[model samples]
Target chain A: SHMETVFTEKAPKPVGPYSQAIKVGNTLYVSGQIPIDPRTNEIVKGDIKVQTRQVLDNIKEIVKAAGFSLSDVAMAFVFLKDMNMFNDFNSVYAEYFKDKPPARVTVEVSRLPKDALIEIAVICSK
Target chain B: SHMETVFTEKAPKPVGPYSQAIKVGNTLYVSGQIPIDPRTNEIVKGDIKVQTRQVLDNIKEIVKAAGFSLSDVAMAFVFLKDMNMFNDFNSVYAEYFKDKPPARVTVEVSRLPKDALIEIAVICSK
Candidate 1:
């Protein structure tokens, strides 16, 4: 009735209670991402631009580890603390995903871990 | 491979760093929503009825924004700070989604931003 859990080293290790991605046949569902560096488990710093970059980098690595690519991304879910920073984050985001952006939904939540401004989740496949 | 990104203005400007929806071939993925009025950004006023109404309205707008309809929604994941609002949310939600409601999963997260009672995420297509 449900899907199977999928794992990949390319993406960061699950920090707390979830898997990096789960696959049900061809569909691969990824868990929400924070800006944490998989190697250190500490969020990378700088600005929303740097954080967003790390998040996308994690996504690309996970997709490839799963035998997919940014081009394979089907959908994404994003969470943010500030709607005020939309343009700054997206300007940098748009460049990485130049070709196919993927279906998406984004909302500003009250706060995220460590009071970070952004978090992203994606669904993709090969 | 991943599908493609879909963009639309009908939904409130993605407050933060994400698009309204993304498409992976036939499937469309939408982000979770706070009841904020796109025009105002403040979560709309009133009860879950008002908030849910606005959320669905946003969904309808984004669906239309993507060139799809409410009936195209395949599945949804709703997050409510108070599951007590489930019936209230569902009652109002049922009106917006009259035909086949998508397969759904609801969970009560610990809390949401602004201490709002409800949040919703959707996955739909054309």
Candidate 2:
């Protein structure tokens, strides 16, 4: 009848009070995920390519826990600290959305939590 | 079923492949909106307050078109060109979410489409 929160230790615990994702009916709203190593609970240290992989992996974990898949995503929001890494980020991102890529919007932001190089969030429905 | 795209000329035409908003069941995923005048299709030129009003007004038009209202918004993502405008943006934002404000995350972004000062996207459920 209302919203349900989905969480998993495989992904980093939310740095803030918000849930990893919230579901209502058949729709899921995933929170922005930064490239934090869930095990260490710290921002992953690496280049944009490495950081992008970590961010997507985190989203995959939460979406799976929510009983969905990467293919179920209807839309995604990609935030990068620098636009120069667009190609680098997309190379890794393309691997996950190999088929039926969700409608997406990408932008370069001045900062993210823990000053992460990239952050990704998605909306999934089935 | 597949996703449904929502559109209204009252808001700026989408700058890319995305729609103004996408709906799955009762949930709505509105695309990021900048302060562009619908009639002219030009980025509204003004200070943060003026810009904020235009953006929210554009959202209101679309939400209303979609058979929802600002009150249905469950969450919002706010992107600003500079953190200095946070207060100014909030002042106008508060007027809309005066009661039971939606969960939100605000960040300073390096840039936005058309070099707008602020951009906002929302998730709405009813």
Candidate 3:
């Protein structure tokens, strides 16, 4: 009745005291995702574009595993290690959301866990 | 039927493409907020403690404007420009959530808009 924890082997397992995502009623609170490859339990290799894709792909898989759709994402918080890579990041980001994109705030961060080039967290609902 | 945007003069106005908050069904999605004083529309002055207070304050007003309670905040994503300020920031943050603090992910970011020391965004439901 309060909240439910979501997990899926398809996405990276959370290493901390957090669920991959938490669902309360119809809404889902997904943790900020670093570009970790769940299959290898390692950070994906590459630049901002590759890292961004991995992060979003991870988010997609987790959302699907939680019984939600990517289109249901209402908002996204994006953290980039370098602001210079915004365009490169967005170009790949555009591939994931071809139509109406969720509302977002993109900001450059000092660093990311595992030194990932990008991290993304989203809120989705039905 | 769809989503509703939320705003209030008591909080800082969004200068970009985002609203102060967005509501869909029982859920509310708040944008990341820096310590911008709504009255002056300028970043508040001080260290991480001061900035964290203002950030949470802004979120409180926005949540109230959206007809939600701070207690309803289910999750929070916090970004700080410096990791050393975590304790000071958390102490001030603890003032707001005396009992059940929402699920949270706090990390140091490289930078923030207006050079704020901290920024926070939240997801709440009623």
Candidate 4:
């Protein structure tokens, strides 16, 4: 009846009390994911495309860990430290969401945890 | 259907063809609502506190139309052009959800649509 916290070693552990994702009924709420690489245990020190790959890769693993898939993602919220990186970010994002792309919103944020270039969150439903 | 368009005359109409909100099962994903006065067909132009009030009101009406309440809101995504107005925005928002406030993500953005001080989107579940 309540939500279930989801976690996976394949992604970076949360810095706070928040779960990697929360599953309730048929929907899964993914917390903000920066470019932190689970293997490195540190934020990826790279450009937007590289960081965005890490972030998206992290989401994929979390979704898989929760018995869901990337295709289940129906909504995505993206926060960027710089809007100028939008084009580069989208190019990488386009590769992952080439088909059945989820509804998305991208905005420029003043900052991010670990000073990462980008942060992404999502809502997945089946 | 997984995605159903939720609309009402009390809330500001979509600037484009997008729905004011979309219902996917038990969750409703609200679109970004600015400080527009739907009834007057004009923006409620003012300070961040004043603008935030109108944006939330618009969200409230959309949620209600979808057969949900403020208490059902699980997540809130807030965007502000000025980080300095965070306190002012919270004060206005607090009065609306005095108890059991939803999980919120507030960040300063480079700009807001219509050059408004604030914009908000929400996800409600039941």
Output the number of the DockQ-best candidate: 1
Look at candidate 4 and tell me the lDDT of residue A74: 72
Top-scoring candidate (lDDT):
2
Fnat of model 4, as a fraction: 0.13
Task: Supply candidate 2's per-residue lDDT for A38.
Answer: 98
User: Order of all candidates by DockQ, from best down to worst?
Assistant: 1, 2, 3, 4
lDDT of 4 by residue, A38-118 (tens): 988898878999999999999999999998888777778888888778778888988776544665566776789989999
Every candidate's TM-score, chain A alone: 0.88, 0.96, 0.96, 0.96
Candidate 3 residues B8-124, lDDT tens each?
A: 999997554456787886778888888999989998878888888999999999999988999999999888888889999989999998878799988777777677888898888
Q: Tens-digit lDDT track for model 1 on A1-126?
A: 567666766567776778887767677778787887877778887888888888888877776676666776766776777766667777877876666556555556677876677888788755
Regions of model 1 farther than 4 Å from truth: A1-8, A12-27, A31-56, A78-120, B1-5, B113-115
TM-score for each model: 0.68, 0.66, 0.65, 0.66
- In Å, residue A49's CA in model 3 sits off its true spot by 10
Model 1 interface RMSD, in angstroms?
4.6
- Docking model 4 quality class: incorrect
Q: Looking at model 1, give its docking quality level.
A: acceptable
Against the unseen true structure, what C-alpha lDDT does each candidate score? 0.73, 0.85, 0.84, 0.83
Task: Please give, for residues B1-126, the per-residue lDDT of candidate 1 as tens digits.
Answer: 444445566567754435567655667777666787877868888997888888788877877766678899988878777778789889998887788778988866555555567777788766
Sort all candidates by TM-score, best to worst: 1, 2, 4, 3
